[PDB]
Design a protein around this ligand. Structure first.
Ligand SMILES: [Mg+2]
Ligand SMILES: [Mg+2]
Ligand SMILES: [Mg+2]
Ligand SMILES: [Mg+2]
Ligand SMILES: [Mg+2]
Ligand SMILES: [Mg+2]
Ligand SMILES: [Mg+2]
Ligand SMILES: [Mg+2]
Ligand SMILES: [Mg+2]
Ligand SMILES: [Mg+2]
Ligand SMILES: [Mg+2]
Ligand SMILES: [Mg+2]
Ligand SMILES: [Mg+2]
Ligand SMILES: [Mg+2]
Ligand SMILES: [Mg+2]
Ligand SMILES: [Mg+2]
Ligand SMILES: [Mg+2]
Ligand SMILES: [Mg+2]
Ligand SMILES: [Mg+2]
Ligand SMILES: [Mg+2]
Ligand SMILES: [Mg+2]
Ligand SMILES: [Mg+2]
Ligand SMILES: [Mg+2]
Ligand SMILES: [Mg+2]
Ligand SMILES: [Mg+2]
Ligand SMILES: [Mg+2]
Ligand SMILES: [Mg+2]
Ligand SMILES: [Mg+2]
Ligand SMILES: [Mg+2]
Ligand SMILES: [Mg+2]
Ligand SMILES: [Mg+2]
Ligand SMILES: [Mg+2]
Ligand SMILES: [Zn+2]
Lengths: 64, 87, 95, 117, 272
RNA sequence: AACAUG
RNA sequence: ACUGCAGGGGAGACUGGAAUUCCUGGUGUAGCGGUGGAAUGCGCAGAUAUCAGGAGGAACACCGGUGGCGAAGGCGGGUCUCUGGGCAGUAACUGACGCUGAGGAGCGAAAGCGUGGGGAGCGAACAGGAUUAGAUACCCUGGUAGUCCACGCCGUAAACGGUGGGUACUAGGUGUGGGUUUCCUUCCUUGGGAUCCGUGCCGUAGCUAACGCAUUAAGUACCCCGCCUGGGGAGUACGGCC
């Protein structure tokens, strides 16, 4: 049900600004855990990647 | 701290027979290293109270191992004080 | 010698002929201390997601260094002082 | 004595009042007639009928400067917020795209204390 | 680094002193010393133009390098950190690699043995002197010159610094230590960092005679003089001065800066 | 809005 | 000890974007603000609105939950540096080295105190406006200390799960956090089972004055400590200690 737990050894990366376009919303906000099906540990690893991508200007902090 | 090889040189000087890890000589000598390594942690960072509390736990554990070796063989107690330090 | 990954955003009014020779002066201070450099991938121009320091474009450089911690913190101090560098991001790559 | 064919219509709408300003796409104000400009005083300014009179008064005063089409940027938690958009349409404008530009702090500054009313 | 005395005498009850822990070599460098003498407040006419001056310990002048124009690229080594009676900061003796001795104001964090660069290719380290064109914005600097080539004038007391706000075309915007926003030329030079000895404002001098050692001679209030002496003099008991407060020469309080002084074009904002 | 007391 | 694993546990340094306010400039004209309703107030000397630039401070939207970590107080922007504890497996080593702990010591929200910084917003005190018989209040407009930081002092909270620590046992059902291991292991399904450590809901025996608790006990038991002895007077006086 979780993509990262099923498909093993897939790198959740702050560089990879194309994996992180899914798992964010149209305003730019981090999606909820119960709508992406992630576990606790990969939702942690997604949100840190989004916070690090926003600070290297690969993702906007907010964008209507 | 205390990487997996950094504890090996302490065990070669204070372990009894080439595989000893649990004797009062080995456990005090590893605690004396961590107490030393963490009091120089606490000369920078004078307000790290959470780390300093973990030092009082090692002091309490080292003092109980010192008391056990002095109840069972006082001559092992005298040499271990000389090789590491008391007061 | 810990494996680090330094991401550098460069000013877009530079030229791509002098991106790699310019930062070679920065990377030579890593090599004096026993440091190791592996991958100096240059992404080139890319549209920034927001306007950093009145610029909309910028050159992304990934350093991929492996050195002592005292020398990597020495490096990005010299990178932020350089006026061509807009941002610097240092991350460890192991666990 | 100007001519600007396409502009922007900013609508601020609070619990007390509504201000309807019309600008160019660079943010230079053409006309601004708000809800207390039309004769209203006190809590009558926050009614939706006071909002739609302000949206007419700013629209037909902007058409004297040749404005034919506006973009709408609304903000604020007011109920005179959709009676204003449906009053720029029924005054001779084409309202285009509608955006919410309400400011949202990222746990920023401290709000005032809650009212023991 | 403020040693407090113990209350052994009534004159040392609240008193304190520097710890002097920063100082190496208690004696000065003999070739860089010029003599001084006191004045007691007197000008060339022999009359007191500045009151409350005189007495004081004997002093010698240490030649400070406030120019630092002629060693762009010759590095120096901090040899000693010495006491200077003529100022509130400490001074650092520099041993340049060519063979010349100099004194500069010691910045915060320029301990003995550190290397000090100069010129347009120096590093942004505490003690290096650069033109303002080569210093990035937001940097705390000290010993800044007003005109190019003129010598350091601004922010050079102990603990004081200027924040470099921005540079537009030919002018840098500075925040001076009073909150004054001044605009100066970008070819002006400045030393990177902040002036050391920043704890000396907290020294409680304990007794009257300890300030007599420093050259400060007593100060009589105007309200206990006679009306021929001061405009606040007079009265039969003690008063407030029977008028709005003035100087001993009858001038009122208020702004004494020239309202059309030539440097008004360079001041962005007055202090707060 | 509003309103105490026995 | 070794091998892994999860984590807002802590301290230091650097650093990011949103918003509030102020400053400068443009556009612009007469209102804005506030409430149950108003007024004080701000503005017409160019406010509010709006766009661009700049300075500064404080808190970190989304993730975020019923979830995690910490002895408790507490802990969530990012990165780096230093550092503390826990869990599981292996059973390699030591050989009862344990538990509790009067006194003592250390840590200990917020307010407050000292010295020195900093001060956007908020906001005791204070001031005006309203309401009212009055209004030393609630509501509105302003607004100082304080809230922030560095270093010390203070040692109190409905500091609470109103439940001191250790240990052993005594039906299950059902979510969730961290591991380990088994049959068709890919039956893709990351499903069921077993087991170890948490954290919730229900529920049996038993306990309880009742409400309720119920394998995370307030059940059945053993070890040690703190405390209670009608309500007021009173956690006060007097003496001492800080
Ligand atoms: Mg992870
Ligand atoms: Mg003469
Ligand atoms: Mg005087
Ligand atoms: Mg007299
Ligand atoms: Mg006179
Ligand atoms: Mg008199
Ligand atoms: Mg009298
Ligand atoms: Mg942490
Ligand atoms: Mg902003
Ligand atoms: Mg301000
Ligand atoms: Mg404005
Ligand atoms: Mg953080
Ligand atoms: Mg045996
Ligand atoms: Mg105990
Ligand atoms: Mg006790
Ligand atoms: Mg304390
Ligand atoms: Mg406090
Ligand atoms: Mg204080
Ligand atoms: Mg103060
Ligand atoms: Mg009042
Ligand atoms: Mg108030
Ligand atoms: Mg007070
Ligand atoms: Mg601190
Ligand atoms: Mg609490
Ligand atoms: Mg109690
Ligand atoms: Mg018990
Ligand atoms: Mg359980
Ligand atoms: Mg229950
Ligand atoms: Mg009971
Ligand atoms: Mg009694
Ligand atoms: Mg008492
Ligand atoms: Mg007493
Ligand atoms: Zn997962």
């Amino acid at each position: 049900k979780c993509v990262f737990c099923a498909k093993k050894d897939q790198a959740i990366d702050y560089k990879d600004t194309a994996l992180l376009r899914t798992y964010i919303s149209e305003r730019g906000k981090i999606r909820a855990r119960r709508v992406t099906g992630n576990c606790v540990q990969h939702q942690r690893d997604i949100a840190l990647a989004v916070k690090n991508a926003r600070e290297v200007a690969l993702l906007p902090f907010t964008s209507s | 701290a205390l990487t997996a090889e950094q504890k090996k040189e302490i065990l070669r000087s204070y372990g009894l027979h080439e595989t000893d890890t649990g004797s009062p000589e080995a456990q005090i000598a590893l605690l004396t290293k961590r107490i030393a390594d963490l009091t120089e942690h606490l000369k920078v960072h004078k307000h790290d109270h959470h780390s300093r509390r973990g030092l009082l736990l090692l002091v309490g554990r080292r003092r109980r191992l010192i008391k056990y070796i002095s109840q069972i063989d006082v001559e092992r107690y005298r040499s271990l004080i000389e090789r590491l330090g008391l007061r | 010698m810990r494996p680090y990954e330094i991401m550098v955003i460069l000013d877009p009014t530079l030229d791509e002929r002098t991106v790699a020779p310019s930062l070679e002066t920065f990377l030579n201070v890593v090599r004096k201390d026993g440091g190791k450099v592996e991958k100096v991938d240059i992404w080139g121009k890319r549209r920034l997601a927001y306007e950093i320091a009145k610029h909309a474009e910028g050159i992304y450089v990934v350093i991929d260094v492996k050195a002592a911690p005292a020398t990597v913190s020495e490096l990005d101090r010299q990178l932020s002082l350089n006026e061509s560098v807009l941002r610097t991001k240092v991350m460890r790559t192991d666990k | 004595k100007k001519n600007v064919p396409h502009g922007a219509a900013h609508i601020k709408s609070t619990f007390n009042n509504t201000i309807v300003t019309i600008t160019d796409p660079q943010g230079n104000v053409i006309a601004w007639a708000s809800s207390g400009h039309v004769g209203f005083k006190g809590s009558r300014k926050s009614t939706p009928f006071a909002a739609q009179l302000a949206a007419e008064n700013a629209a037909r005063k902007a058409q004297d400067h040749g404005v034919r089409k506006v973009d709408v940027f609304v903000k604020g938690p007011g109920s005179g917020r959709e009676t204003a958009i449906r009053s720029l349409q029924a005054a001779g404008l084409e309202v285009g795209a509608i955006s919410d530009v309400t400011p949202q702090p990222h746990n920023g500054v401290r709000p005032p204390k809650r009212r023991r009313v | 680094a403020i040693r407090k005395y113990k209350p052994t005498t009534p004159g040392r009850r609240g008193a304190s002193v520097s710890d002097f822990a920063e100082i190496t070599r208690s004696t000065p460098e003999k070739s860089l010393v010029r003599p001084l003498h006191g004045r007691g407040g007197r000008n060339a006419h022999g009359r007191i133009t500045t009151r409350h001056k005189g007495g004081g310990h004997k002093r010698a002048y240490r030649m400070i390098d406030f120019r630092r124009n002629d060693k762009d690229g010759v590095n120096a080594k901090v040899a000693h950190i010495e006491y200077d009676p003529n100022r509130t900061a400490r001074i650092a003796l520099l041993h340049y690699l060519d063979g010349e001795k100099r004194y500069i104001i010691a910045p915060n964090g320029l301990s003995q043995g550190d290397v000090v660069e100069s010129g347009a290719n120096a590093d942004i380290k505490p003690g290096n002197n650069l033109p303002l064109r080569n210093i990035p914005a937001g940097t705390l600097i000290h010993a800044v010159e007003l005109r190019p080539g003129g010598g350091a004038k601004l922010a050079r007391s102990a603990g004081s610094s200027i924040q470099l706000l921005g540079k537009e075309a030919s002018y840098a915007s500075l925040r001076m230590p009073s909150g004054e926003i001044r605009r100066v030329d970008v070819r002006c030079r400045a030393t990177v960092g902040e002036v050391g000895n920043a704890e000396q404002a907290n020294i409680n001098w304990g007794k009257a005679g300890r300030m007599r050692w420093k050259g400060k001679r007593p100060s009589v209030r105007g309200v206990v003089m006679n009306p021929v002496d001061h405009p606040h003099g007079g009265g039969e008991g003690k008063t407030s001065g029977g008028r709005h407060p003035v100087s001993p020469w009858g001038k009122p309080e208020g702004r004494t800066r020239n309202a059309n002084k030539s440097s008004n074009k360079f001041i962005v904002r007055r202090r707060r």
